[PDB]
Amino acid sequence: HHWGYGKHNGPEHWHKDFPIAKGERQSPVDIDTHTAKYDPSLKPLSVSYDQATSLRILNNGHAFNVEFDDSQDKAVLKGGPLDGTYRLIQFHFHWGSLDGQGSEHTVDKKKYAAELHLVHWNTKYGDFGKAVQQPDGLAVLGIFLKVGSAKPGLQKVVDVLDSIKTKGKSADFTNFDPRGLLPESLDYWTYPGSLTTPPLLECVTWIVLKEPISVSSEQVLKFRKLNFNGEGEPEELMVDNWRPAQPLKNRQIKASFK
Ligand SMILES: [Zn+2]
């Protein structure tokens, strides 16, 4: 038995096992665009994915992760509000049962159909496990998804989902280029936060892009065919695997644009 996104084990229950759920820098949050302050000291983000090496795609019971080889400096995130170099380890999404919900972060209370999270860890800490124990251990690039035109670069991901329908299933997923999932503009909002799933560690520098990417209804429909359950257990569609906005508390959201 364990945490999930159901009535009995969902986000409002997480604090019992993970008391930090009620902490001082929890994610996600609502981004109030009018209250976010432009910070002209913020540098342009540096997204260097040319040598990215995807390996595998996994249904872990809460979402699906596209994993990358992070044993060398190959896909890295630098600049922006970041000091140092962060290595891409995996990306995953959060989505809803309906196009009107699914994103974790919200913009002026607006919920997008889904949200992509490209997770990177700070190379100064040697590995992901050690990085999550540090306040500046991770950098997660969040990108909103809206339903409209299809995202060509996402199709390869969607077509493999049938092979990892249930919890615990994985499939080879090599040569996937995450650059095909990035919007045109890299304008962003940034604030100190946490993982949005248990253990909910407060180790993340969040970088959320202003510009959403568009995906087709057919593409998101396929996300909704995945299962939270394992093979041979009652089908529970993997939908609404998003944590709602948490109190901003003593934090300021900064914008890289005016
Ligand atoms: Zn996430």
Tally the residues of the chain: 258
Residue range 1-258, CATH number = 3.10.200.10
Burial class (CB in 10 A: 0-12, 13-18, 19+), 19: exposed
Beta carbons within 10 angstroms of residue 62's beta carbon = 18
87 alpha carbon – ligand 1 mean position (Å): 16
Tokens (6 digits) for 17: 């096992």
What resolution in angstroms, rounded to 1 decimal? Answer: 1.5
Q: Are strands 188-193 and 204-209 parallel, antiparallel or unpaired?
A: antiparallel
199 alpha carbon – ligand 1 mean position (Å): 12
Q: How far apart are CA 128 and CA 119, in angstroms?
A: 10
Could you tell me which of 175, 106, 171, 191 has the C-alpha nearest to residue 144? 106
CB neighbour list of residue 18: distance below 8 Å, 6 or more residues apart: 3, 198, 199, 200
Cα pseudo-dihedral 246, 194, 79, 56, rounded to 10: -120
Give me the phi and psi of 35, to 5 degrees please.
Answer: -95, -20
241 alpha carbon – ligand 1 mean position (Å): 9
Q: How far apart are CA 125 and CA 49, in angstroms?
A: 21
- Which residues participate in the annotated binding site for substrate? 196-197
153 alpha carbon – ligand 1 mean position (Å): 19
Cα pseudo-dihedral 88, 141, 166, 20, rounded to 10: 100
- Which residues participate in the annotated binding site for Zn(2+)? 92, 94, 117
Q: Is 62 noted as a catalytic residue in this protein?
A: yes
CB neighbour list of residue 81: distance below 8 Å, 6 or more residues apart: 42, 190, 205, 207, 254
- Which residues participate in the annotated binding site? 92, 94, 117, 196-197
Q: How far apart are CA 188 and CA 34, in angstroms?
A: 14
> Which entry of 8, 34, 62, 120 is annotated as an active-site residue?
62
103 alpha carbon – ligand 1 mean position (Å): 9
Core vs surface per residue 161-172: b (16+ CB within 10 A) or e = beebbbbebbee
